[PDB]
Amino acid sequence: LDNVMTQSPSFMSTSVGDRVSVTCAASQNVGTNVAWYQQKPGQPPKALIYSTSYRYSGVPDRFTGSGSGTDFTLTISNVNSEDLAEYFCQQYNIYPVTFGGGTKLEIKRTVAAPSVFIFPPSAEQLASGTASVVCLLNNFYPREAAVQWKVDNALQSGNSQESVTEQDSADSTYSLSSTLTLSKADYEAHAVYACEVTHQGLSSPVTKSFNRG
Amino acid sequence: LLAQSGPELVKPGASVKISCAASAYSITDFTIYWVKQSHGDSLEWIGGIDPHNGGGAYNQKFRVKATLTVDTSSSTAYIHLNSLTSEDSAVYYCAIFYGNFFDYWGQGTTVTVSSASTKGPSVFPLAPSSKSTSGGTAALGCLVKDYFPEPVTVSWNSGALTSGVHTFPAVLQSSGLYSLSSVVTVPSSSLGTQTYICNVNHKPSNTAVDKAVEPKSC
Numbered sequence: 001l002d003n004v005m006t007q008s009p010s011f012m013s014t015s016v017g018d019r020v021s022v023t024c025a026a027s028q029n030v031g032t033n034v035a036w037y038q039q040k041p042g043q044p045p046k047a048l049i050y051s052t053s054y055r056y057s058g059v060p061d062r063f064t065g066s067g068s069g070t071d072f073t074l075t076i077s078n079v080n081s082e083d084l085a086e087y088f089c090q091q092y093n094i095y096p097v098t099f100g101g102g103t104k105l106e107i108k109r110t111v112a113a114p115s116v117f118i119f120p121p122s123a124e125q126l127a128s129g130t131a132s133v134v135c136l137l138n139n140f141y142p143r144e145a146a147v148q149w150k151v152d153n154a155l156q157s158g159n160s161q162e163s164v165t166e167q168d169s170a171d172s173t174y175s176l177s178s179t180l181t182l183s184k185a186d187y188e189a190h191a192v193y194a195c196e197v198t199h200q201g202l203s204s205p206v207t208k209s210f211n212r213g
Numbered sequence: 214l215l216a217q218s219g220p221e222l223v224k225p226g227a228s229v230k231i232s233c234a235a236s237a238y239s240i241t242d243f244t245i246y247w248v249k250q251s252h253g254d255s256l257e258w259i260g261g262i263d264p265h266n267g268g269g270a271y272n273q274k275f276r277v278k279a280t281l282t283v284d285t286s287s288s289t290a291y292i293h294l295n296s297l298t299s300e301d302s303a304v305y306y307c308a309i310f311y312g313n314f315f316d317y318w319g320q321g322t323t324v325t326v327s328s329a330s331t332k333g334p335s336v337f338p339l340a341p342s343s344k345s346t347s348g349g350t351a352a353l354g355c356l357v358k359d360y361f362p363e364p365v366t367v368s369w370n371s372g373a374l375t376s377g378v379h380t381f382p383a384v385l386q387s388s389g390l391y392s393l394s395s396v397v398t399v400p401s402s403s404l405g406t407q408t409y410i411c412n413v414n415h416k417p418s419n420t421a422v423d424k425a426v427e428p429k430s431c
Contacts, residue, residue, distance in 0.1 A: 164382070
């Protein structure tokens with residue numbers, strides 16, 4: 001008796017320029033009381049379509065919806081980088097209102113090699129007893145990348161974590177930080193700190209390093 | 214603006230009132246509803262009310278859990294969440310809609326159910342230097358370390374600087390505390406003209422820091 005909305009696919013990658021389709025099938029006849037939402041990274045879900053095929057003001061005409069009863073489709077034509085987002089279908093025919101599991105639209109783009117920057121721990125942090133070294137990999141594609149930490153030539157392990165940006169809305173690249181965390185005392189015992197990064201865009205690993213002081 | 218109340222850290226068993234106000238227009242002239250989003254993915258409709266023409270409804274799932282009210286006097290909607298558990302940790306969205314028009318949502322309210330006490334972040338500069346500059350481009354940032362819970366907002370120069378800024382998703386450390394960095398790319402020739410300040414806000418702890426990040430010196 002509860003309207004489950006099954007969305008497909010989970011992930012979808014497309015190129016700028018292409019036509020993409022997102023499917024949504026309701027477990028029970030829902031008429032045409034279906035709507036679609038778009039949620040860009042960091043933002044609330046924004047409403048694109050209502051009544052299956054009607055677009056809300058300020059919504060590009062390259063977004064169209066169709067279907068009826070149990071089968072529904074969201075077509076995005078001339079896909080643009082700004083379109084990178086998570087899409088949700090919804091049924092508001094019967095209570096409770098239900099949403100689909102969502103579809104993540106990712107954009108394919110050409111290989112881009114990362115810019116690498118390293119940052120020593122600030123003096124203020126060192127006075128606090130801990131030391132964070134940060135390695136930034138900027139504006140690269142694709143998402144996969146290997147960051148290796150070396151301290152006085154000794155390969156590190158188990159003492160760093162990575163964070164990755166969501167694809168950029170304008171250029172579709174990723175950014176990545178790798179943070180090496182040592183104790184004030186261990187940082188002070190070593191001199192050469194380096195992060196080595198390997199990536200599809202580099203024909204050979206790139207190393208960034210600095211000397212303590 | 215569906216202005217929603219700030220992030221909330223609530224202990225298990227306790228409750229919270231999340232508010233929502235339409236700045237400029239009376240929120241109670243339309244139908245207001247709330248949705249729950251878990252782990253930044255799945256969306257659940259909780260319920261709604263329309264003060265003027267009825268048709269208020271609840272999701273059987275949140276019947277006991279949630280109570281929706283409205284305050285016409287100050288054009289503000291509310292959701293009351295009682296007997297909270299870890300499963301209630303989520304982002305709660307307030308939304309208003311009229312027939313075939315605006316389907317407008319609020320910025321959302323992050324609720325974290327924890328027996329842990331808040332911890333405001335430390336903010337250290339990620340100083341630009343010859344090793345943080347590629348050609349004519351330089352990178353600098355702020356490390357926002359050891360805080361709980363989420364979220365935390367970061368802006369640059371009070372919001373006037375947005376191009377080139379990357380604010381990383383928070384990541385959990387083995388201490389159980391969150392940490393993240395915010396970096397920006399700028400012309401290396403500008404490094405000595407306009408100052409660069411990162412504005413860090415952590416509402417649950419009441420932490421407001423304005424760290425200036427300058428080139429390294431000795």
